[PDB]
From Swiss-Prot, chain A:
One of its GO terms (biological process) is vacuolar acidification. Transmembrane segments: none annotated. This is V-type proton ATPase subunit B, brain isoform. Expressed in brain (at protein level). Expressed in all tissues tested, but highest in brain and in adrenal medulla. Belongs to the ATPase alpha/beta chains family. V-ATPase is a heteromultimeric enzyme made up of two complexes: the ATP-hydrolytic V1 complex and the proton translocation V0 complex. The V1 complex consists of three catalytic AB heterodimers that form a heterohexamer, three peripheral stalks each consisting of EG heterodimers, one central rotor including subunits D and F, and the regulatory subunits C and H. The proton translocation complex V0 consists of the proton transport subunit a, a ring of proteolipid subunits c9c'', rotary subunit d, subunits e and f, and the accessory subunits ATP6AP1/Ac45 and ATP6AP2/PRR. One of its GO terms (molecular function) is ATP binding. It comes from Bos taurus. Keywords: ATP-binding, Cell membrane, Cytoplasm, Cytoplasmic vesicle, Hydrogen ion transport, Ion transport, Membrane, Nucleotide-binding, Synapse, Transport.
UniProtKB/Swiss-Prot annotation, chain B:
It is a peripheral membrane protein. It is found in: Cytoplasmic vesicle, Secretory vesicle, Synaptic vesicle membrane; Cytoplasmic vesicle, Clathrin-coated vesicle membrane. The chain holds residues 6 to 106 of 119 of the full protein. GO terms for biological process: pH reduction; proton transmembrane transport. V-ATPase is a heteromultimeric enzyme made up of two complexes: the ATP-hydrolytic V1 complex and the proton translocation V0 complex. The V1 complex consists of three catalytic AB heterodimers that form a heterohexamer, three peripheral stalks each consisting of EG heterodimers, one central rotor including subunits D and F, and the regulatory subunits C and H. The proton translocation complex V0 consists of the proton transport subunit a, a ring of proteolipid subunits c9c'', rotary subunit d, subunits e and f, and the accessory subunits ATP6AP1/Ac45 and ATP6AP2/PRR. Subunit of the V1 complex of vacuolar(H+)-ATPase (V-ATPase), a multisubunit enzyme composed of a peripheral complex (V1) that hydrolyzes ATP and a membrane integral complex (V0) that translocates protons. V-ATPase is responsible for acidifying and maintaining the pH of intracellular compartments and in some cell types, is targeted to the plasma membrane, where it is responsible for acidifying the extracellular environment. It comes from Bos taurus (Bovine). This is V-type proton ATPase subunit F.
From Swiss-Prot, chain D:
It comes from Bos taurus. GO terms for molecular function: ATP binding; ATP hydrolysis activity; proton-transporting ATPase activity, rotational mechanism. Belongs to the ATPase alpha/beta chains family. Keywords: ATP-binding, Cytoplasm, Cytoplasmic vesicle, Hydrogen ion transport, Ion transport, Lysosome, Membrane, Nucleotide-binding, Phosphoprotein, Translocase, Transport. Catalytic subunit of the V1 complex of vacuolar(H+)-ATPase (V-ATPase), a multisubunit enzyme composed of a peripheral complex (V1) that hydrolyzes ATP and a membrane integral complex (V0) that translocates protons. V-ATPase is responsible for acidifying and maintaining the pH of intracellular compartments and in some cell types, is targeted to the plasma membrane, where it is responsible for acidifying the extracellular environment. The chain holds residues 413 to 612 of 617 of the full protein. This is V-type proton ATPase catalytic subunit A.
Amino acid sequence: VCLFLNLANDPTIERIITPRLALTTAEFLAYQCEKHVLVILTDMSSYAEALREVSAAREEVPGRRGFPGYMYTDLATIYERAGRVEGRNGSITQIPILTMPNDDITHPIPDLTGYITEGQIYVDRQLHNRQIYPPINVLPSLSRLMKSAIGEGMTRKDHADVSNQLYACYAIGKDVQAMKAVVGEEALTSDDLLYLEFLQKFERNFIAQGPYENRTVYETLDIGWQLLRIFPKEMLKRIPQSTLSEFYPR
Amino acid sequence: KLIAVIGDEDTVTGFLLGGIGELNKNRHPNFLVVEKDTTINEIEDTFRQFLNRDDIGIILINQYIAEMVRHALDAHQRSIPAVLEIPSKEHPYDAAKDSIL
Amino acid sequence: RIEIFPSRMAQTIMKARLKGAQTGRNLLKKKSDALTLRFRQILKKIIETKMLMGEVMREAAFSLAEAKFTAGDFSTTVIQNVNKAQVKIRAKKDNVAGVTLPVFEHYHEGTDSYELTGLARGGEQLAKLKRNYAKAVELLVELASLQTSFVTLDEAIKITNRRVNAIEHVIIPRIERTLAYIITELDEREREEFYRLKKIQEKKKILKEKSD
Amino acid sequence: PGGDFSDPVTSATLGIVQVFWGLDKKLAQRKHFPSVNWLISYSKYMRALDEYYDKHFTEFVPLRTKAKEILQEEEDLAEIVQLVGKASLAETDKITLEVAKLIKDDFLQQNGYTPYDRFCPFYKTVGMLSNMIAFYDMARRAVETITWSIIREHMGEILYKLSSMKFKDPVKDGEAKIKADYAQLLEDMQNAF
Amino acid sequence: PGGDFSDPVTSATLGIVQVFWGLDKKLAQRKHFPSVNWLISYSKYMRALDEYYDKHFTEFVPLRTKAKEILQEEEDLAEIVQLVGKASLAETDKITLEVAKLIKDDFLQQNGYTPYDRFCPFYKTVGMLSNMIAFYDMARRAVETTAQSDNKITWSIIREHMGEILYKLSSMKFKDPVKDGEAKIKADYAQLLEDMQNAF
């Protein structure tokens, strides 16, 4: 890990040359040495505030909502120094952490990054106050290249299908919890008795990974089938019959 | 908190024998036998008499008898007391109070 | 119809007002749908039992022919020595979707009144006519417990499906076309400060070349 | 009072500060003092403190992780009861709804113009949190089998003792700690019923 | 521009003008002319003008106090019947919803191109308002005093029986300027038809 970090005390011109210093070593390690680099750009929303100070230092006019007009280039200059090439077997992967203010996705920092990047991961506040530790919301967060990234040659054969079912059973799990408060806990349906216990096991056992608990992709899908031990066979409509017969009985 | 019955002659002698009748000498009897020579007004007031009483929970009445007092029970659109339509020995239950849907 | 003043912090307030009214409909939609599903299967239970009592009231009234044909005439004896009731009602309370529901409970108590009736001729064609009409009144209080349950649901599904259609067609399109007004009124001030700031940018240059 | 997270003096503040006690105006309309609302407020200083907590106050961290749970599980249910009406919707979640009202008026409320509530020490603070969460684990298992409609005024002498713990003198050092031990064992007899 | 009164021309005007006749755009789709919106409009000449009113027209200050009030209670009850329906409404409020609707086509509507409403004098204006408010005041007593005991007036009694007197009210505005002293007599004559029917 080659960390370098810029405090709030530090000069704000150094906050612009920090992602420039980040990727130009991360594309020396990926396109001049053959490593697989992963770049983490924390506090992105604090980067565009350091772009606003320099743009208003040379006496420019502002743009939409204060941020300058060329921010879609300056973000694309540091987001699109990624991907992998054909001449070498190196690669560079970006996870830019950014905090949208006041839960507004129409803000120009989480909107102009939605046109350059490839799908979001949505940390939620309602999950955090319930005090599961990683607050990753599964419903509004999709990975765009998730289809290409998994498979039998990559990680596993049933990974393309158990991820399609865990999200789908969580979707039917959500309105069942809202149904519990509107009619009653026992008189609703015999179907919703079983989805409601999975949501207690999906929240606490699967996505409430501990602070130091490492968990491989094989250890993840083992919990992925432990939660699908519930909902006996031919309820899981998304999983095909080939991969369902192999992994579900154990 | 008792049951009322209009019915007919052969109906009311079976349901009194069932054990639903009560003779209130103060207010009124809780049943009304209808013969061949009972006016429709006598069925009309007694339907209103059973409706205004607080202790009446069910009003049993044959649909063959309730067909002429259909206009009065179509004005009763409350939940309590419940009006029930029972078959006679002629023309059984066909088309009463399932007509709300 | 516009509600309040635009152009700061009312957009976030109206986005809180919209989000509450968006799932407030969907919560009340599931209430009105579970009420209708409770109303749909209670219709068939009315249908399957209102023809079933038509057989029981044909079977028990057939026993009325099995009845005074043997033993005289039960048309003045039974209608002249009744004082109190033997089978009564108790008003219990059911509940579905948070709506209180009246239900009638069977309650036989107190005495017999036609214990000594016939007794010298008949009395076995009677008191099975009682059992044919104690079972008939046992079924008919269960159907009265659903007849007063049927019409109280259609008074609570109509005053719920209006509140669905009041939120869906009045409250939300008043909030939605208010939120489209705060956006443009923000924009008509964001280009107003672009004219005042660019006027100073030109007046800082004209004052500069006057010095040069 | 306004511009909650969209104000360039507040939006620049939240990127620097670690603790943020949001004073809410909805609680100040009902004169809830202090007016800190417990949802939008935060503290980044929860990892740096448990090394101190597991030395002195070893009981506190398992209380606070559930003390913040109860205040949110009531928050969604308050959006339910407002629309569909209080049919109480549950019994395992009704006990959470009133042990939160115990928290929002006895634990969280604090009138600073009294000679007792103007400063609460930590052993008076972790004492009230231990007692009012021991009512929450014991009445959770009590409905694993009774209903809170029985419990509410059957344990009314205990619900008065939990609401009256915030009146003790700040000079009662051992005597408030015995009172914490006294009121907790009296709930143990009632759950043994 | 666009019918928006939050405008730097209008907002700088209303700090200077004392009277403000706020016209409405919804009141011109429905042909309600003149389209003066009676809720947002105001005037600050009233306290200064009742001294004139206590000399010439000595009954009009209690008239507009109830005439503005019946238009005030109609607006709060209009939002009621568009959400929860008019079936659950009370009887002291259903009489309010009719006379305020009787005001909105008689009093406030005025066809400026016909010979009788192109210019009305002030005795004609105080004339038909002294009757429609007295009608609301008399129909107040038909619900208030006999409230529970008798099988009372449910106002469908009134609306199907007093339709000829309401036709005298709904056609009172048709007095062209060929009659001057006759209009005050007809104002008390249509009141005398309104006077006797509370006994009937």
